[PDB]
Amino acid sequence: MKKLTGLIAAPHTPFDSSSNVNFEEIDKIAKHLINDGVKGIYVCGTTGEGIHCSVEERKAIAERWVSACNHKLDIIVHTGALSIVDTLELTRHADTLDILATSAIGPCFFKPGSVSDLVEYCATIAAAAPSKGFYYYHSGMSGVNLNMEEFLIQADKRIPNLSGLKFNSGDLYEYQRCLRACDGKFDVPFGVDEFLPGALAVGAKSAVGSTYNYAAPHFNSIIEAFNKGDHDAVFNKMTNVIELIRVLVEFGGVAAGKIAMELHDINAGDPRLPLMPLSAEQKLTVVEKMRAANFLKHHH
Amino acid sequence: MKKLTGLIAAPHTPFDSSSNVNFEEIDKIAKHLINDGVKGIYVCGTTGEGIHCSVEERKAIAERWVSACNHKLDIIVHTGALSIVDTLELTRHADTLDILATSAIGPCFFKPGSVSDLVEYCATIAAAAPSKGFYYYHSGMSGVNLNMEEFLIQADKRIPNLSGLKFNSGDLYEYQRCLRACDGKFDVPFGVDEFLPGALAVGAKSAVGSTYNYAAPHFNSIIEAFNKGDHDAVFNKMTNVIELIRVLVEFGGVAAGKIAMELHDINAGDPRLPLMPLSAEQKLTVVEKMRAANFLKHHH
Amino acid sequence: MKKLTGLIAAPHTPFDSSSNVNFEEIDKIAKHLINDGVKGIYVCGTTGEGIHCSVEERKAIAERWVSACNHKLDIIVHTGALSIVDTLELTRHADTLDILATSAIGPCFFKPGSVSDLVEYCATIAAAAPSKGFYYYHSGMSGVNLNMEEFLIQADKRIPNLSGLKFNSGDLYEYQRCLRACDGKFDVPFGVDEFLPGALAVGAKSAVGSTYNYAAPHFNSIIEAFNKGDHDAVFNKMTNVIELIRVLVEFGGVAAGKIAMELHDINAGDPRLPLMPLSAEQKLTVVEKMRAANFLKHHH
Amino acid sequence: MKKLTGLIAAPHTPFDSSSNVNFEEIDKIAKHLINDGVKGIYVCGTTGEGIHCSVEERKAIAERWVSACNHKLDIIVHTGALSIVDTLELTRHADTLDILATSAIGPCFFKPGSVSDLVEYCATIAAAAPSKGFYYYHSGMSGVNLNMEEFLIQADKRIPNLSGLKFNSGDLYEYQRCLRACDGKFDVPFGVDEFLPGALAVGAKSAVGSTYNYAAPHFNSIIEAFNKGDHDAVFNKMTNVIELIRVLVEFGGVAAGKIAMELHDINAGDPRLPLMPLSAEQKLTVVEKMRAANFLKHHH
């Protein structure tokens, strides 16, 4: 298996003014991602509001990404839902698409209470797309707080198509144990963009995140600086990352990140309820503060 | 408006050995509930595993309850889902049925961050079933930890069909503030069965819960004792309730509660993933310990 | 053993304008408590800011209460501190006083990680005052979240002078299991004043709390109403309790409760850092809102 | 001001078999720390069990470190206690010693509820040792979860001897905002040893921690490798760090870390209650697993 490298964007699902999926904007985001140096996409995940879409919408969205990317990006589709019936309907559909892997986030209502229980849930899902890899997505936001090192070690026995897990957590001690589980066999992309050089320094080889939708060249420059050992340059580039994150924290991560796509000529619309929309004034503020953060390049 | 009185069961969704909905067992549970002195049902809620079912299954389940109850019970249908599209499809369907009210539990992934935001989400839902009442279901398990007194006061302005909220929380200080919000206008059924006499004592008039599926006569006897001021009798009856709850805590609330339906000749099957099934040995243990708890009556 | 009955106040430690202990005001509070129908006191606890005082101050405070009460109240002294050396110095001193029992709250920094560990810590403390009873104080605020039923069952074996535990938690399911542990052997006073009728209804015989410092006659009237089965009267009296609690939540429980002592001609001063003082305007507001809550009696 | 550099050990307080302070072992630890390449010490902190010692013991301990270090290490004394009276008695004593700075951890029982409140508490403490620097110690274990960037910005106005804060938290996004607060003015040593290269990569210049008591040469080699950009070497050295941490998690951080001092001929004894002692078998296991982790050097 080849572990992912570089930046994996978790794209938005653009909604038009009637809160319907805007498929033409999905086409424009894919071209943008390819031009800005992203290597893969994780679709219908948290940033993608996949759980805000119906099964029918999710199936059309995953097909739209596969057509829009024209084989130039690795594609991972998140198929998780609270109902195993919906999840299995999405996962079976995903096994028919030209994609790299499926994935499921920890269920957030009845939360798996042990590693063994979580392994059984993931094994049922991964078996419905046995031709594709399978990533567990460890979320924090899910409330599923189980030992991920043990998850990889136990799931290795039970899930034949296991790829590894996406680590959306700041716990670098657990992350480094995951990197080493089963002699380093599994692929463990890191998922906290504002911690990126910290994860690089302890062994991350790829990162999945939402800011890569609009700041990928800037983060690729952090990766290159870190690699060259230019730690001064990593530091000054993270100053612009911290100003970006501040906009997300003030205005909402999905909402502000959607508006930030205007910096690349993309109209991603508002989020869906229960996420709230920004006002017309707030949208102008988001774009002005993202410009002031100074991470944009006038090129690809 | 007439506030609910007495016990409102949150019924299970029985699954057969292929994990499909068992509609004939729904018929048998409804007859049982009516015979055991339940006054209403809250369907497709947490105990009902509504979020484990697809939209199509949920619509068939709600119709099956309305046919099976033959107008003898008040029916509240929980229509909440993580996708507002699914929620609105269920809520519109529910507005066509002969039921009392719809309801939605706090979304557990992106959690409403203020009372105002939660009021906007509930107002969008309640407007899709404007002919029926609407209860918010306050869950704890949802992770949506906002001031429910303020929710009622703010939602009163914004939701014309607001009935009140179901209070699945042990916070009796917040519960009593809810009972009094807007001069006592709203209906606030209590939702923690093992605290029942405590909520009675501070003003509860009805309770919604899962143990009422199989212990309703016993809890109706607590209500009658409390009413008569026989606090000794309340105490000795709660000793049997505590032995019941211990079985739920040891073996899982949905799983053990489903097996307990065998005490009334009902085969409710296993839960769905991510909830795990009990072994054949554990199912025999659940039934023996529920018998030993001594809350069953050999009559209706 | 005779279980405590009625209201046990947790008195404040009055501080003068130099933040020194005001011993003469302790005398005035004791006379007040006896006149207002309190039956016991729990001194140097949370409301008492015992952990804000030095070992030397704490020893003088406990002696001042014993002199001021003139044998008319049962006295429990909280001797807990983060240092076992301080705790044991206080506990040994307390064994020499004419008091009913000592007590310790769960340590809040390194928190006992199992019931067994907590039993060993309490056994070491209770052995330093072997002539007096010993109550564990279960606090929530402590962060020590262990099964208190199991604590009583395990400590029964290990602590010869064990009296029971004071239950400052809203978990009525755990509270009722404590009431029944070892065939109902232990004394378990309830500790959430705004839940009082709820705990009465499930078996509480006494309650320890801070509002009893200034609202004892009103809560004694709730106890009498509940006993007579006058649930309407319990309800209308709890309306005044909820208006009292609102003042505590808005202005701080220790700070506002200290100012409320002005309603009984007592100058309890400000709290100590890290608790902040109220402004002169806020102190006038606290007293006006406590008057408006309408729980005061113009008599004893 | 010169920011700290390199490793700052948080030493243990050795206890003999009567649970008294072993002052002669303090002498031996200081010589060891100086020989193993530590640059400073943070005494009477969490690893030091300072809160388990009385005020009188704490004063003798701080004096013993100052005599034992013979001016070869920078010394920071943690003076925090739950009672401001104890804290101020310790802080005034510390102002008389030849040390670099005092420090206080967030109080864990009544927790400061705003940045402003925490600034007022720290300002009162730092003013009692106005000749020494002052570090706030941000702990997580304290439960004091306030914005530390805002703490530095607000405290800059109010505390004339403010040095900065010790950051015992894995939140690298907050840590990098602290590094930059007030144009990078404050000294912010990092406090999570198992995350060290991650904090290096985002700008840490020093680290305070307990593993530096017995693994300082190994972590100094990580610092040197990271500096040279040898990320392969950082990775393989962190494999030995993860095996060390596993021993702490299995057997208790203070208890196992005390036993690990046997690897340097130091008898640090057991912790004090409420921390539990290891059995004779467990102590042999701790030393065997710390040897197997392979981070020890047969030299200084």
For D78, the enclosing helix (H) or strand (E) is strand D74-78
Q: Is B166 a catalytic residue?
A: yes
Q: b/e string for C199-212 if b means 16 or more Cβ within 10 A?
A: bbbbbbbbbbbbbb
**Residue B1 near residue B163, CB atoms below 8 Å:** yes
Tell me the shortest Cα–Cα distance from D31 to chain C, in angstroms: 28
Taking the CA of residue B242 and the nearest CA in chain C, the distance in Å comes to 7
C93 min Cα distance to partner chain B (Å): 38
Q: What size, in residues, is chain D?
A: 300
Sign of the Cα torsion D149, D151, D157, D160 reads: negative
Contacts of D117 (CB under 8 A, 6+ apart): C274, C276
DSSP string over D103-139: EEEPPSSS---SHHHHHHHHHHHHTTSTTSEEEEEE-
For residue A180, which of C116, B193, D239, D184 has the smallest C-alpha distance? Answer: D239
Cβ–Cβ gap A81/B82 under 8 Å? yes
Q: Does A48 touch chain B (CB under 8 A)?
A: no
> What is the rounded CA–CA span in Å between residue B62 and residue B90?
10
- Strand order of the β-sheet with B40-43 is B162-167, B133-138, B101-105, B74-78, B40-43, B6-9, B206-209
- Nearest residue to C172 (alpha-carbon basis) of D105, D64, A208, B194: B194
Closest by alpha carbon to C109, among C74, C83, C73?
Answer: C83
**Cα A263–chain centre separation:** 20
B-chain CB neighbours of A141 within 8 Å are 109
CB contact under 8 A, D172 and A198: yes
Catalytic residue among D28, D39, D132, D166: D166
Contact present, C140 and C108 (Cβ < 8 Å): no
Looking at CA atoms only, how far is residue B228 from chain A in angstroms?
39
In three-state secondary structure terms, C101 is strand
Chain CA centroid to CA A251, Å? 20
Domain extents for chain B? Answer: 1-300
Residue A101 in 3-state DSSP? strand
* Residue among B172, B176, B197 whose CB faces C170 most closely: B172
∠ CA C260-C265-C269, nearest 5°, is: 55
What's the distance, Cα to Cα, between the start and end of chain C in Å?
A: 29
Has B72 been annotated as catalytic? no
- Marked catalytic residue, from B121, B136, B137, B214: B136
For A202, the closest of D229, D238, D245 (CB atoms) is D238
DSSP-based three-state secondary structure for B105:
strand
Nearest Cα neighbor of B136 from B175, B104, B177 is B104
Position A280: which residue type? Answer: A
Backbone dihedral angles phi then psi of residue A51, each to the nearest 5 degrees: -70, -10
Tell if the CB–CB gap between D121 and C273 is shorter than 8 Å.
Answer: yes
Cβ neighbours of D85 in C, within 8 Å: 52-54, 57, 272
Distance CA D69, CA D42 (A): 12
Query: CB distance from A201 to chain B under 8 Å?
Result: no
Amino acid in position D68? A
Residue C64, classed as helix, strand or coil, is helix
* Amino acid sitting at position C289: K
Are the C-beta atoms of residues C274 and D112 closer than 8 Å to each other?
yes
Question: Which residues have a Cβ under 8 Å from the Cβ of A161 and sit 6 or more positions away?
Answer: A126, A129, A130, A131, A132, A133, A134
Distance, CA of C218 to CA of C210 (rounded, Å): 13
Task: Say if strands A6-9 and A206-209 run parallel, antiparallel, or are unpaired.
Answer: parallel
Q: Which residue(s) pair with C8 in the sheet?
A: C40, C208
Run of H or E including C156: helix C148-158
| Beta-bridge partner residues of C207 | C7, C190
Cβ neighbours of C112 in D, within 8 Å: 274
The DSSP H or E segment spanning B170 is none
Identify which of A120, A20, A34, A24 has the alpha carbon closest to the alpha carbon of residue A70.
A34
Q: Do B54 and A85 touch (CB under 8 A)?
A: yes
Closest CA to D106 of D117, D94, D95: D117
A–B CB contacts, 8 A cutoff, strictly below:
83
Cβ-count burial C117-127 (b if 16+ within 10 Å, e if not): bbbbbbbbbbb
Q: Which of D15, D90, D110, D114 to mutate to test the interface with C (most CBs of C within 10 A)?
A: D110
* Chain A positions in Cβ-Cβ contact with residue D201 (cut-off 8 Å): 197-198, 200-201, 226, 231, 234
> Quick check: A249 contacting D, CB < 8 Å?
no
Asked if the Cβ–Cβ distance from D173 to A195 is below 8 Å, we say yes
Q: How far apart are CA C111 and CA A101, in angstroms?
A: 43
Q: With breaks defined as C to next N over 2.5 Å, after which residues does chain B break?
A: none
Active-site option among D136, D137, D175, D212? D136
CA distance A275 to A266: 20
Radius of gyration of chain B (CA): 18
Alpha-carbon distance values, D216 to A212, D7, D38, D89, D209 (Å): 38, 7, 6, 33, 10
Pick out the residues of the known binding site of D for pyruvate: 47, 208
Map residue A171 onto helix, strand or coil.
Answer: coil
Reading the block at residue C295, the tokens are: 């729980």
The contacts of residue B124 (CB under 8 Å, 6+ apart) are A273, B84, B88
- Nearest-CA residue of chain D relative to C139? D109
A102: its two tokens = 């499926």
Contacts 24+ apart (CB under 8 A), B23-29: B23/B60, B23/B64, B25/B266, B25/B267, B25/B268, B25/B269, B26/B61, B26/B64, B26/B65, B26/B68, B27/B64, B27/B68, B28/B265, B28/B266, B29/B68, B29/B213, B29/B261, B29/B266, B29/B268
Rounded Cα gap, residues C39 and C220, in angstroms:
11
Phi-psi region of C5 (alpha: psi -120 to 50; beta: other; left: phi over 0): beta
Centre a 10 Å sphere on the Cβ of residue C172 and count the other Cβ atoms it contains: 29
Do the Cβ atoms of A201 and D234 come within 8 Å? yes
Of B166, B237, B258, B283, which is the active-site residue? B166
Q: In this complex, do A83 and B52 lie within 8 Å of one another by their Cβ atoms?
A: yes
Q: D249: closest CA among D200, D211, D197?
A: D211
User: Which chains contact D through at least 3 pairs of Cβ atoms less than 8 Å apart?
Assistant: A, C
Helix residue spans in chain D (DSSP H): 23-35, 55-69, 84-94, 115-126, 148-158, 172-184, 196-202, 212-227, 231-251, 253-260, 280-292
Return d(Cα D247, Cα D289) in angstroms, integer.
7
Quick check: B54 and A275 CB within 8 A?
A: no
Lookup: tokens for C121? 């810590």
Residue pair C185/C156 in contact by the 8 Å Cβ criterion: yes
In the structure encoding, which two tokens stand for residue A241, read together? 């990352």
Of D130, D192, D138, whose CA–CA distance to D165 is shortest?
D138
Provide the token pair at B277. Answer: 């099934």
Say which amino acid occupies B67.
Answer: S
Annotate D135-167 with b (16+ C-beta within 10 A) or e (fewer).
bbbbbebbebebebbbbbbbbeeebebbbbbbb
Calculate ∠ Cα D217-D218-D223, nearest 5°: 90
Neighbouring C-beta atoms of residue D230, cutoff 10 Å: 15
Q: Choosing from C42, C136, C212, C214, which is the catalytic residue?
A: C136
Query: What one-letter code names the amino acid at B57?
Result: E
Q: B–D contact (≥3 CB pairs within 8 Å)?
A: no
The rounded distance, in Å, linking the Cα atoms of B213 and B207 is 12
A121 lies within 8 A of chain B by CB: yes
Alpha-carbon torsion angle A208, A211, A212, A215, nearest 10: -150
Q: CB within 8 A of C169, min separation 6: which ones?
A: C138, C139, C140, C175, C191, C192
The candidate with the shortest Cα–Cα distance to D223, out of D253, D263, D193, is: D193
**Spatial distance between the Cα atoms of C154 and D263, rounded to a whole number of angstroms:** 37
Q: Chain B contacts of C203, Cβ < 8 Å?
A: 235
Q: Which residue has the tokens 């200081």?
A: D30
Closest CA to B192 of B168, B171, B173: B168
CA–CA dist B100, B242 (Å, integer): 32
Neighbours of A246 (CB within 10 A): 15
CA D79 to chain CA centroid, nearest Å = 13
**Dihedral sign of CA atoms D67, D70, D71, D76 in order:** negative
Question: Dihedral, CA atoms, D82, D88, D91, D95, nearest 10 degrees?
Answer: 180
- What are the φ/ψ torsions at residue C203 (nearest 5 degrees)? 120, 0
Q: Are A239 and A222 in contact (CB under 8 A)?
A: no
How is residue C51 annotated by DSSP? G
Contact predicate A143/A113, CB 8 Å: no
Resolution, expressed in angstroms to one decimal:
1.6
**Which residues, in sequence order, are CB contacts of D165 under 8 Å at separation 6+?**
D135, D136, D137, D138, D148, D151, D152, D178, D186, D188
- Indicate the residue of C51, C85, C141 with minimum beta-carbon distance to D82: C51
DSSP reduced 3-state for A252: coil
Q: Does C108 touch chain D (CB under 8 A)?
A: yes
Q: The domain at A1-300 falls in which architecture? A: Alpha-Beta Barrel (3.20)
The SS3 call for residue A290 is helix
Q: Which two tokens stand for residue D225?
A: 């490798």
| Strand (E) or helix (H) holding A135 | strand A133-138
Q: How many CA atoms lie within 13 A of A287 on its CB side?
A: 15
Q: Which of C82, C117, C142 sits opposite D51 (nearest CB)?
A: C82
Nearest 5 degrees, angle CA C199-CA C205-CA C211? 65
Beta bridge partners of C187: C164
**Six-digit token string for C42:** 């729990």
The burial of C285, by beta-carbon neighbours within 10 Å (0-12 exposed, 13-18 middle, 19 or more buried), is given as middle
d(CA A180, CA A199): 14
Residue written as token pair 């205007």 = A262
